[PDB]
Each structure stands twice: as C-alpha cells, then as structure tokens.
Amino acid sequence: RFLKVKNWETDVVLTDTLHLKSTLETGCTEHICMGSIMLPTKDQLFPLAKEFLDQYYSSIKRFGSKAHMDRLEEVNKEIESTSTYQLKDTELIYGAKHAWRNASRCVGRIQWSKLQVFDARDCTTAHGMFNYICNHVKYATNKGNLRSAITIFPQRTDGKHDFRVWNSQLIRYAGYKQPDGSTLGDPANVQFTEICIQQGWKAPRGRFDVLPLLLQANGNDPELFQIPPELVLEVPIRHPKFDWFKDLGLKWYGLPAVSNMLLEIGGLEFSACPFSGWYMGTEIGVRDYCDNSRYNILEEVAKKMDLDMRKTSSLWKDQALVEINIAVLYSFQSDKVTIVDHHSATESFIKHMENEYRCRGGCPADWVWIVPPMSGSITPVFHQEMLNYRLTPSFEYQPDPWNTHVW
Amino acid sequence: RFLKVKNWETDVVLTDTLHLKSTLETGCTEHICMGSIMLPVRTKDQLFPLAKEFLDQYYSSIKRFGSKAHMDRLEEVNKEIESTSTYQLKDTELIYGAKHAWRNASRCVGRIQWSKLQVFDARDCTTAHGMFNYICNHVKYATNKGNLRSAITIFPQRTDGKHDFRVWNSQLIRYAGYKQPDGSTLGDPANVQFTEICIQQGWKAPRGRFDVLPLLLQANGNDPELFQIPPELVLEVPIRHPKFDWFKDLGLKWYGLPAVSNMLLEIGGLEFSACPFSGWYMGTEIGVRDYCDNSRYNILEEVAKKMDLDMRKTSSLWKDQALVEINIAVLYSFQSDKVTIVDHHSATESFIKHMENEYRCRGGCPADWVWIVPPMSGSITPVFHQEMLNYRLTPSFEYQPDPWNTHVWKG
Ligand code: HEM
Ligand code: HEM
Ligand SMILES: C[C@H](O)[C@H](O)[C@H]1CNc2nc(N)[nH]c(=O)c2N1
Ligand SMILES: C[C@H](O)[C@H](O)[C@H]1CNc2nc(N)[nH]c(=O)c2N1
Ligand SMILES: CS(=O)(=O)C/C(N)=N\CCC[C@H](N)C(=O)O
Ligand SMILES: CS(=O)(=O)C/C(N)=N\CCC[C@H](N)C(=O)O
Ligand SMILES: [Zn+2]
C-alpha cells in the first residue's frame, strides 16, 4: 500500500502514496501487464464533482470551510436541477493545470504550474473557435519565445453538441498518396488531408503544406480555415558542420499543439481543449523525421554522409540519427525558437519527480513514454523506476470525430 | 479470452491466447502498472499440481498426451513425491524444461535461439571442486574459440533449502571493482561488493581495471570456495575502432562469453538455484550499458574528449555522438576477432520474426518492452513500435536473493 521506487544509477529511493488516490483503471491485471499498449448521468456526476471540489478546496487550504460546504451544496444543487454544472474560473484553471500535472506520459511536467488558461466557454461558432485558436497560436508562439497555453471550449452536454478540433495538432503538414505508391509529405496525416480535400481545401500538394483547421462547434458540421501564415512559425533545418544538410529541404514548425484530446475535470468533459508547450528535439529529429511510417529520411541522410549502408552493424542508421538530431536542435536555437534537448528535459523530469514525491507523495509516470526514443540509457529516466496510475483531472484520448459525427 | 497487440509501424495485429495459461503474478493491478519496477521450501501439497502441469505440458509437446507413458509418469512422480517429498526429472524433461524457461523469458530479446541450447546435466555434482570442473567445461564448450554456442549447466535442485548449490558470481566471467580510499572506483563498479567478498575469502587481487574475478562456488549448502578460471579458457577482445586509431589507447577490452549465474531455474515446481547459462552478446550490452552507464565504466567523457566534441552544452549531442562511436568499435572488434556478437538492429528484427512465429504456433510470446527495446536508438528498431504483453509462464528463470545475504556460515 506504500510503494517504493528506486533509481538504479543513484540508489535514491522514493515512497509513493499518491497512487491510493487513483481512480481510473490501467489496463493491467495481476496476470498481465499492458504497459506497452498505446490505448488500453446525474448519479455518476455528483461523486466526481465532489471528489474534484474536495481536492480543489484542500489545495487552497480551505478544506471543510463554510465556503467549501457551500460550493459542494451549490454544485449538487445545479446537478440535481440541470444535470450538469459550471466550473468557476478558479476551478477551471486548477483543473487544467492538474490535468497536465497528472499526465503520466509527459516528460515536461516540471512546467505544469505555468500554463496560461484561455477560457473559451462562451464560444458558439466555428468562426469563434478559429479566432480563439489564432489568439492561442500567437500568444503561445510569442515570436519564438514559447509559452505553454490551453484554450478550453464549452463542455459536453447531451453529446450531440460536441465542440471538436478535427486536426490532431493545430499545426501539422499534409500527407498525400501518390500514383507512384509512395507518400508525399507526412504519411501520418493522409486520412485527415483527404477529409480536408473532400471538404473543399485546395491542397498545394507539397512536402510541407500546413494543414487547414477543421473546426466543429456545437455538434455542427466542421468548417475549414487557414491559419494566417504569419502566425505559423517554421524553422528551416540546417547542420552546424554539414553545408549540404540544407539541400534536403527539411523544415518543421515551432509550435506543438495537441488538439484531439479530452480534458476531464470534476466529471465534466471538454472535448475541444487544444494545448501547447514546446518541443523536445527527439520528437522531430527521431520520430517525425526517422520513423519508417513518417518522413523516413534516414536512407537519404546516410547517403549524403557516405556511410557504409551494406551492413546494419556499421551503425549507419545510428550515426545519421545523431546528426539529424544535432541539426534540429541547432536550427531551432539559431532561430531563437524554444526547444529542449532530451538530456536537459529528462534531467528536469527527475528533479520534478523528486519535487512531486516530496510535496505530493508521488508522480504517475509511464516509463515507456518518458524514456526518449534515442540514447535511452544515457538519460537518467532510463534508470528511474516509475509507477503508472491514472489520476483526475486528466487528458484522455477520444475517438476521431469523423468515425462518430453524423453529417 | 483473446488479447490483441498492434505494431504501429506495420499495422500487423496479433492475437494472444497463451496468456490464459499464465499462473504467476506480475506486480501490476487494475489501479497500478509496475512495468518499470526492476524486481516487482515447498510442501508435498503444492508440489504435485506443479509437477502435473509441467508433465502435461511436456507430454503434449511430444504428442503423447494421455498416453500410457504419460499416465505412468504422473503416477510414478506422484508416488515419488508422497514417499520422498520431491521428485527427479528425467533427462528429457530437464532438457525440455531448460529450453522452455528460456522460451518463456519475457526480458530476453535473443529468444529466436531458444530451441538450440546445449544442456549439461550436473545433478550428480557434490562438491565445489566438482562445480568448478563442470563450469570450466561449460565455458570451453560455449566459447568454442569465438564461435559461441548457447549452453546451460544445471546443478542439483533445492531440497530443504539448507543444502543449496549456488554460484555466488552474478556472471561466470566478470571484472573486479575496487573502491579506493579517495572514493574513486578502479575496474567495474557493479562488482565492488562481490570483489570485497572474494578478497575476504582469500583472493589475491591484481587490482587493475579488467581483472577476471575468481569463481566463488557453494555446493550442498557448504561455505563457498574460490577457484580461478584457467585464463586460456577466458576469451577476451581488445576494443579498437575502424577509423579512430586512438581508440585502442583507451586500453579497453571485454570478455566474449556472457554467462548469467545468479538466477534460479524453476521446472515443475523443482528449484535449480545454480544453473549458469550463456548465449552471446548484443553489442549495446557492452558499448551502451557496461561502458557508458554513469555507474559502470563511465567512458563517455574521455571518448568525447578524444573526439574533440563540443562538450560545453548537452545540446551538441556529444554524449550521443560518442555513444555511437563506442558501439561501432565494440561490433568492429568482435567481428574482426571472429567472436560472435549481434548488433541491436539484427537482434530486434530477428526478435519480431520470432515473436510473430510464436503467436502463430504457440498463441503468444510474453515480452517485457522495457527490457526488449535497446538502450540506444530505441525507435529506429522495430521493437519500439511493437505492442507486447508481459505475463509469467513456467518453466522459468527467476531472481533470487544474493547468497551472502542468506547463507548460514559454517566456518
Ligand atoms: C512545455 C514543454 C513540454 C514538453 C517539453 C513536453 C514534452 C512531451 C513529450 C516529449 C511527450 C511525448 C509526446 C510524443 O511522444 O508524442 C509529451 C506527451 C504529453 N504531454 Fe507534454 N510537453 C510539454 C508541455 C505540455 C503541456 C503544456 C501539456 C498540457 C497542458 C502537456 C500534456 C501532455 C500529454 C497529455 C501527453 C501525452 C499525450 C499522448 O498520450 O499522446 N504537455 N509531452
Ligand atoms: C543467444 C544469444 C542471446 C542474446 C543475444 C540474448 C540477449 C539478451 C539481452 C540483451 C538481455 C537483456 C540483458 C541485460 O540488459 O542485462 C537478455 C536477458 C535475458 N536472457 Fe537472453 N540472450 C541470449 C541467450 C540467452 C540464453 C541462452 C538464455 C537462457 C538459456 C537467456 C535468458 C535470458 C534471461 C532469463 C534474461 C533476463 C535477465 C534478467 O532479468 O536480468 N538468454 N538476453
Ligand atoms: C508500442 C509502444 O507502446 C509505442 O511504440 C510507444 C512507445 N513509446 C512511445 N513514447 C513516446 N514518447 N511516444 C510514442 O509515440 C511512443 N510509442
Ligand atoms: C528502472 C528500469 O526498469 C531499469 O533501468 C531497466 C530498464 N530497461 C532495461 N533493459 C535491459 N535490457 N536491461 C536493463 O538493465 C534495464 N534496466
Ligand atoms: C504538443 S505539446 O503539448 O507541446 C507536448 C509535446 N511537446 N509533444 C506532444 C506531441 C507532439 C508530437 N510528438 C510531434 O512531434 O509533433
Ligand atoms: C548472458 S546471456 O545469457 O548470454 C544473455 C545476454 N546476452 N545478456 C545477459 C547479461 C549480460 C550483461 N548485460 C552484460 O553486459 O555483461
Ligand atoms: Zn503493467
């Protein structure tokens, strides 16, 4: 019931008690671990509301005050009458920060308390959503000095009036299937791109075409909008030693902004809650550029480096991988666009874990996601035992809207 | 029930039914995943079901389930248990058992090889000297002048827990570690405590950076005894780099034969507490972990210094750059000397093929992703993208506590 985690490089041992406050299920059982699986009424709402308000009032050190009991009454009263309730601004902000704090897959949580929350619950139309999102993009980008932000659209009602951003991220590149059988641009976005085209988007059919936004307000049919190009900061990729690197014609965008998740606070469900921070370099250099099902540039880069590609044991893939990732960090830094390397980020996360253990009694963490996709064991997180469990408020996956929506 | 796993790179989806045959616990629950935790005397009562389950599995494997030979063996084992409180495995069952413990080892990426395992039956051994002789033969056979062959040597099983056979070494071949008065460590820091024990037992330490440790062997619950492996049996590889001529001057070498000796082999409820086994190295074990872990030889700085990398900011990726060069050197050296080794690309690609074959022919393949994914270049290996299910099958290899913690010293 009190659980220990050991760091095997430092022998530091931490005791976790926070897991007892865990509510949602992991997918695992006593017989089987599913740790590496990517996706494992009024009666329901009151305990959920109560549990949240209790933690909220405890956090402002007013647990069991007349203000607390009054609010609990108030939220119960509103549920009994309307079947839902509305969060105070203070609760919304707390809930949002805590959903980030509880995100077991996020290595960047040392930042969790510095999150600008944009309350867009007064939004009613897709044009309204576009305005809120441009404002978020501009604020967060901050001319390259990135600031974490979330924009929160109105909460789910009967579930037939959902607000959704159909894009997986606010800013992403189009993917096209070609007569050739190959893919131009980002293969991850082939399906969404087709949905955009079918909805009327004029695709430039290039390698790095910034997708349009497909915004759904109030369960209505979604609409297309182009983000003003001047609000989309992009970084040309060059290498500090290889003058040829630029001829690869690579670029990426500065602002990572996940737009397809669901924010749950106090049992209320926010299906449109785009949030943004900044990149760890490996996300772009290792995953986006080198995944086989992504831009898959390893072959081309190794060729320019004139590495012996005959045998896997020459580690040509590993050498190219490093140089690609040096270029990504070099380019962002040269252009003064915030980016963090995996050494620095994982070091910060260890310090964050220690803070969380000291001040909160633990930190839910998913090792499979926290350890970077390159140079795993030379980062301190590789050697850190982590306990994974689900706390609320949370960010949850939700099904892609096109599978669900009724036209 | 049927459980699905997806490969997110290929979209291949596999279906697991083998998890239904799993009995032992994982450490996880519906409320908590312990997938990254390193470590999360039986009665006659519990022994016969364990034997029956194992013998049913054995007789099914040889297509003799429900045969007279099957039934007579169950009765024979049952009678032996009630009469003697334990039983003895037939040689065939021992071989099947040891191979299956390997097949079931969810943290092992090398399992494509599981069916080729040379099993040395050392159950007639009685003394530490007898153990030394068995182990020398295992080393020489497995080494095979660099053409490494997988092998296991199996000493007598546990009886009352007071007469255990144990190899105190964590591997048959490993380098000494010495803590210096100034707090620095000479040699391998992982082996400091064991080295101290060896010295206290009477080993004369050469006190260098790569001294092969003596064997410390316990037979029949007796106090352990020291022995030096003949150096001519210990194959070692000097580490050099194909392009960097200064790399040799780091003075690095490593041994060719990895031979884990501190695990317990469980077959049909019987416990083999001394069962050293060996295969061959994946390059990253040495080049990433043994050389570059901060708490091991820790060579990253020195290598990057010699490479003249920009070491003032982590964001130059100097550590990553040096890491690749070290790992190229390890593979180049082993290959140049004709000592078996496998790179992490080959080994993981082979593992995915193994895993797919196991799903099709066995109904599953328990695998621990945390351990299977290599410690460098994770996502450019196919295993990173493979969903895996981890569960415990028997026969199995288990951790056991270190014997210096439990041993009753006779004097
Ligand atoms: C400020 C700098 C941040 C850094 C460096 C960072 C880093 C990361 C990384 C590397 C991942 C793994 C992503 C992947 O492999 O696709 C991740 C996941 C995640 N992050 Fe953070 N993040 C940051 C900010 C934020 C913010 C502001 C939020 C929410 C307010 C957040 C919430 C999440 C969530 C929910 C996941 C898991 C998403 C999933 O399961 O796909 N992050 N983060
Ligand atoms: C033939 C070539 C083999 C290769 C390339 C190989 C590869 C590996 C690697 C890389 C690991 C993780 C090691 C670590 O990080 O410390 C491992 C673990 C393991 N292997 Fe294999 N292995 C091989 C043969 C064998 C054999 C012959 C056995 C037993 C018969 C075996 C049983 C195990 C077990 C039980 C583990 C988990 C050890 C632990 O939890 O500490 N392997 N193997
Ligand atoms: C199958 C496996 O769970 C999957 O590839 C995971 C592994 N670790 C990951 N880690 C991060 N940060 N992001 C990912 O997309 C993944 N993918
Ligand atoms: C805490 C964590 O479980 C621990 O460092 C593990 C991670 N994965 C590993 N994987 C392998 N192959 N070997 C190891 O020693 C480890 N160590
Ligand atoms: C998008 S975010 O909120 O800042 C969190 C983060 N840094 N990464 C999340 C997903 C981004 C994705 N891995 C990508 O490479 O585009
Ligand atoms: C030792 S073995 O049975 O061949 C399995 C294997 N390849 N590795 C297991 C342990 C070796 C250890 N990682 C080492 O670096 O010495
Ligand atoms: Zn688990």
Coordinates of N, CA, C and O in Angstrom, one line a residue, chain B residues 41 157-165 218-223 406-408 410:
Chain B
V41 N 11.6 -23.9 0.1 CA 11.0 -25.0 0.8 C 9.5 -25.1 0.6 O 8.6 -24.4 1.2
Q157 N 19.0 -29.7 -7.6 CA 17.9 -28.9 -7.2 C 17.9 -28.7 -5.7 O 18.5 -29.5 -4.9
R158 N 17.2 -27.7 -5.2 CA 16.9 -27.5 -3.8 C 16.2 -28.7 -3.1 O 15.4 -29.3 -3.7
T159 N 16.6 -29.0 -1.9 CA 16.0 -30.0 -1.1 C 15.2 -29.3 0.0 O 14.1 -29.0 -0.1
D160 N 15.9 -29.1 1.2 CA 15.3 -28.4 2.3 C 15.6 -26.9 2.4 O 15.3 -26.3 3.4
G161 N 16.3 -26.4 1.4 CA 16.7 -25.0 1.4 C 17.9 -24.7 2.3 O 18.4 -23.6 2.4
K162 N 18.5 -25.8 2.9 CA 19.7 -25.7 3.7 C 20.9 -26.3 3.1 O 22.0 -26.3 3.6
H163 N 20.6 -26.9 1.9 CA 21.7 -27.6 1.2 C 21.9 -27.1 -0.2 O 22.3 -27.9 -1.1
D164 N 21.6 -25.8 -0.5 CA 21.6 -25.3 -1.8 C 22.9 -25.2 -2.5 O 24.0 -25.0 -1.9
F165 N 22.9 -25.5 -3.8 CA 24.0 -25.2 -4.7 C 23.9 -23.8 -5.2 O 22.7 -23.4 -5.5
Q218 N 29.4 -22.6 -4.1 CA 28.8 -23.3 -3.0 C 28.1 -24.6 -3.4 O 27.2 -24.5 -4.2
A219 N 28.6 -25.7 -2.9 CA 27.9 -27.0 -3.1 C 27.3 -27.5 -1.8 O 27.9 -27.5 -0.7
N220 N 26.0 -27.9 -1.9 CA 25.4 -28.6 -0.9 C 25.2 -27.8 0.5 O 25.1 -28.4 1.5
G221 N 25.0 -26.5 0.3 CA 24.9 -25.6 1.5 C 26.1 -25.3 2.2 O 26.1 -24.6 3.2
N222 N 27.2 -25.9 1.8 CA 28.5 -25.7 2.4 C 29.0 -24.3 2.1 O 28.6 -23.6 1.2
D223 N 30.0 -23.8 2.9 CA 30.6 -22.5 2.7 C 31.2 -22.5 1.3 O 31.8 -23.5 0.9
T406 N 22.0 -14.5 2.7 CA 21.1 -15.6 3.2 C 21.9 -16.7 3.9 O 21.5 -17.4 4.7
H407 N 23.2 -16.9 3.4 CA 24.0 -18.0 3.8 C 24.3 -18.2 5.3 O 24.6 -17.2 6.0
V408 N 24.1 -19.4 5.8 CA 24.5 -19.7 7.2 C 25.9 -20.2 7.2 O 26.2 -21.2 6.7
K410 N 29.2 -21.8 8.1 CA 29.6 -22.9 9.0 C 31.0 -22.7 9.6 O 31.2 -23.3 10.7

